[PDB]
Design a protein around this ligand. Structure first.
Ligand SMILES: Cc1ncc(COP(=O)(O)O)c(CN[C@@H](C)P(=O)(O)O)c1O
Ligand SMILES: Cc1ncc(COP(=O)(O)O)c(CN[C@@H](C)P(=O)(O)O)c1O
Ligand SMILES: [Cl-]
Ligand SMILES: [Cl-]
Ligand SMILES: [Cl-]
Ligand SMILES: [Mg+2]
Ligand SMILES: [Mg+2]
Ligand SMILES: [Mg+2]
Lengths: 386, 386
């Protein structure tokens, strides 16, 4: 509901809905979609994205750690939820009680879960196979055999699926991806050899699902493309269909003044005016995730690109405008004004980072406004809840 | 509250309490302290910091925008709260009904507030004078006169105080600071001329309060030094007493493995092992505010500095260890292990930023654990609340 600063994220639920629909019609009819909503749904908000993705045809959800899955569960979401990151064994009973599946891939985890098990709950798990990402998951045959051996003492753990993750699916040249693919087929053959039906197999992120044959298996795991953004600039030309960006970020001119030639703006007087300059101030800063490294970046005011001048402060930054505009004038940081569009990728490139990081780090103190069919259908202000 | 990932911030309430106490003892007995708790209390959490600061002898609170003031009010805090950033005129009634003071400095704001006023409320405000920060506040005499003129039509607005803010109080050379000081005395003279008693005057941030005579007035506004960190490395040698860092950031070894020579770690295989290497994985990433630009930074494992290797991912990163450690081994990102200490400033320097940004952007999805007299007295997990 209410928010009291004219700084907000806009999430277009139509865009998300369209992206999931187009992916669904692009992949085979017997391949499910996980909506990947970790990191506050990549800054779009856990619950509304999960809900719209499910409506668009996604059947499953994926988060980073257990607390995020519980956000969804408390919202009344009943679709399957998988935790993709590592979890401590102490989560075994709570995950089970909340119908949440964890990725489990260590004998040591199983040993500790046996010790901590409440004696009644049944927890579902997915085996992560590390096929070259080097992050988590089983890498070796002997390692797998020991893992399966420990599971013999843990009848309360039940396999729901098996997966791996690609490290280079967003690079045009495909050697490392091909290597991972071949490594993973071998890992699936180890499981077969040891008498374990994987049941439900998934490998593909946005880049992989949009590019390659033979990797859909039973399900795909879509994050960035559901939000309507390209996994990388280099594969962007080769995407099968147009992605529709869901998130924009806006503020308003909170103050506007003429500052005489030579006067300083912000901390350590890193900017001085060269003439009498129109300087506008907006209520957004690095506490909101709009970082100091974005000094000199251009925002959009009345369809024109105008530079951020002086140090970005915790809650505010300043802009050099060619002319006066009224107080309350919209300033767009990510999104479109007229003929101009600033993508999260453009912000990322100025920042020396990737679009994923730009969108995901928009702070929880910024409200989200949700648009469906051109109309505001929900507003979430997390500050109201804490 | 409960949290289900072994990744957490520790906030030492004794440190904060000691910092406020020492500042209180350092300044004159008739000078009040605003505890500045905007940006989620610089990542320490709004409410617990506000509470401990008030107990330590701070009498007033300061936030960035209205919603943050309301977090404090809903927690049962009744001490004065000032909003330091700009506010839209539509906030006039809600701020008044919640006993929150806004910074007000524009005739246009007052004009709109008159139109939006509910006919009953009395709102308190502080005049911001811009003496050289260039962000918000009145700069000119004629501008001030017009502002005071508009206030004649707004008897429901009543002055609580008058302030400015320093742009260079953390630089050793003091010319710009001295200029701001002299400019502000002129601005106070303009108010006197126009027959307005400022009532309550405040100018000084942490750096100014700890360094200079003649700038305490009726109150100081302390942020960074309450959190136990220096405003800058250059003034650190000249601080009157030792600041006690309140915040530390920790995680645990979630996975540990031996990775053969030449194998890649994480996205785009930006790291390859040069021998058979111990690679540990932790459950923290850029969605938590631990950004990709920290790749190559050294964290602490068993009192040893060990490098982050490969790309930082949304929810995880990898570390190259000299030897095997068990699962659950503590990894310290900010804080002490044995004879080693990583400050926010050290993280900031590696990141090309300042300590303010490092601490304030620790995500709302990371739980805070509050320590008083060596014991855990509170745990706040914002994900539980949303
Ligand atoms: C196991 C796993 N499966 C799929 C995805 C989704 O990727 P796309 O957004 O390109 O579809 C992720 C996460 N991707 C990054 C956010 P990160 O790996 O940095 O968390 C993941 O970890
Ligand atoms: C008007 C105003 N008065 C006091 C303080 C407190 O100062 P310290 O944190 O340096 O002790 C601030 C703080 N704000 C900066 C951190 P920023 O500009 O990055 O928000 C402020 O804006
Ligand atoms: Cl993985
Ligand atoms: Cl200011
Ligand atoms: Cl002095
Ligand atoms: Mg056997
Ligand atoms: Mg190998
Ligand atoms: Mg330990």
């Amino acid at each position: 509901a209410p928010f009291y600063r004219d700084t907000w994220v806009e999430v277009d639920l139509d865009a998300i809905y369209n992206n999931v629909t187009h992916i669904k019609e692009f992949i085979p009819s017997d391949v499910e979609i996980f909506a990947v909503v970790k990191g506050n749904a990549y800054g779009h908000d856990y619950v509304p994205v999960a809900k719209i993705a499910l409506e668009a045809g996604a059947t499953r959800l994926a988060v980073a750690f257990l607390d995020e899955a519980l956000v969804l569960r408390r919202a009344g979401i009943t679709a399957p939820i998988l935790v993709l990151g590592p979890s401590p064994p102490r989560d075994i009973n709570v995950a089970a009680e909340n119908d949440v599946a964890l990725t489990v891939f260590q004998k040591e985890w199983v040993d500790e879960a046996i010790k901590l098990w409440d004696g009644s709950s049944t927890m579902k798990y997915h085996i992560n196979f590390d096929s070259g990402m080097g992050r988590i998951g089983i890498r070796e045959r002997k390692e797998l055999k020991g893992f399966l051996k420990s599971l013999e003492g843990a009848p309360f753990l039940e396999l729901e699926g098996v997966y791996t993750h690609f490290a280079t699916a967003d690079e045009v040249e495909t050697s490392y991806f091909d290597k991972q693919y071949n490594t993973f087929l071998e890992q699936l053959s180890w499981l077969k050899e040891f008498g374990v039906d994987p049941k439900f197999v998934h490998t593909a992120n946005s880049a992989a699902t949009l590019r390659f044959q033979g990797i859909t298996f039973n399900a795909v795991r879509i994050g960035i493309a559901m939000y309507g953004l390209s996994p990388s600039v280099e594969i962007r030309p080769f995407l099968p269909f147009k992605l529709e960006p869901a998130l924009s970020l806006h503020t308003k001119v909170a103050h506007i003044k003429q500052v005489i030639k030579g006067d300083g703006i912000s901390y350590n007087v890193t900017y001085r005016t060269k003439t009498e300059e129109w300087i506008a101030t907006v209520a957004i800063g690095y506490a909101d995730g709009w970082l100091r490294r974005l000094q000199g970046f251009e925002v959009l005011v009345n369809g024109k690109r105008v530079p951020i001048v002086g140090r970005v402060t915790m809650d505010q930054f300043m802009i050099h405008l060619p002319c006066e505009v009224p107080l309350g004038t919209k300033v767009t940081l990510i999104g479109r004004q007229g003929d101009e569009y600033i993508s999260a990728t453009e912000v990322a490139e100025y920042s020396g980072t990737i679009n994923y990081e730009i969108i995901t780090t928009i702070s929880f103190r910024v409200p989200r406004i949700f648009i469906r069919n051109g109309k505001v259908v929900e507003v979430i202000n997390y500050l109201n809840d804490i």
